[PDB]
Amino acid sequence: VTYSEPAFWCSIAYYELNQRVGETFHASQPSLTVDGFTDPSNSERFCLGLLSNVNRNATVEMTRRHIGRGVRLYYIGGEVFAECLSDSAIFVQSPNCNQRYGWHPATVCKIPPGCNLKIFNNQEFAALLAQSVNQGFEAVYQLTRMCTIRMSFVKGWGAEYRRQTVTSTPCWIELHLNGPLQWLDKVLTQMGSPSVRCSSMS
């Protein structure tokens, strides 16, 4: 297998509750904001305010009005950061981040306005990828979760909150890191197949 460098360092999908809303945003510049405004043609702004959803109700709509300046996402070397530009907090679930601090990988971290958090470190990811090959195909396969980061605007979820899953928050986004996914692919294509058999029938 051969590889070409991704034109986009990440891709971002927006969600309301359990429903995907709008097109996937593909990020070509190393810094970008996901905000609640309405510029449709800026390669550095994923503007959520112009996305329609005939099905959305009042909780989602009030929340959307509070995204505001939203979240700034950028990378420096092999490290990815999120900065809360919104007047309201944002809540991040990054397995790579959680493993760094010894937390459960489903832990949700709160970012108050004006603060930033390192949500991904590639060097820690490479180390985990190196160890996963000793665990078999399925172990490597799950590492895609290390390359996906989920973030909710305004509303928290998890142990400290009444909302328990990300699909219960009104306004959230799903970030995929394309560089690390390519390195994962280079390993997966050399791992064989899983040992347990699937029948065509079951």
Partner 1 sequence: PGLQKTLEQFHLSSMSSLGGPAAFSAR
* Part in contact with a copy of itself (CB under 8 A); list of ranges 75-83, 98-106, 119-127, 133-141: 133-141
Report the alpha-carbon distance of residue 187 to residue 183 in Å, rounded. 7
- Residue from 3, 101, 123, 134 binding a copy of itself (CB under 8 A): 3
Residue 120 three-state SS: strand
Tell the smallest beta-carbon distance from residue 94 to a copy of itself (Å): 14
The contact pattern for a copy of itself, residues 35-74, with x = CB under 8 A and - = no contact, is --xxxxxx----x-xx-x-xx------xx-xx-x------
Question: What letter does residue 130 receive in the DSSP assignment?
Answer: H
**Least separation, in Å, of the C-beta of 6 and a copy of itself?**
4
Q: If residue 27 lies in a helix (H) or strand (E), which one and from where to where?
A: strand 25-27
Burial of 171 (0-12, 13-18, 19+ CB in 10 A): buried
Residue 113 partner contact from partner 1, a copy of itself, none using kind-dependent CB cut-offs of 5 to 8 Å:
none
Of 4 and 200, which has the nearer Cβ to partner 1? 4
Residue (42 or 164) nearer to a copy of itself, CB: 42
The answer to whether 167 touches 18, Cβ cutoff 8 Å, is: yes
Q: How far is the CB of 202 from partner 1 (least distance, A)?
A: 32
CB of 192 to partner 1, least distance (A): 11
CB nearer to partner 1: give 31 or 164. Answer: 31
- One-character DSSP codes across 75-107: EETTEEEEEE-SSS-EEEE-HHHHHHTT--TT-
Tokens of 108: 């949700």
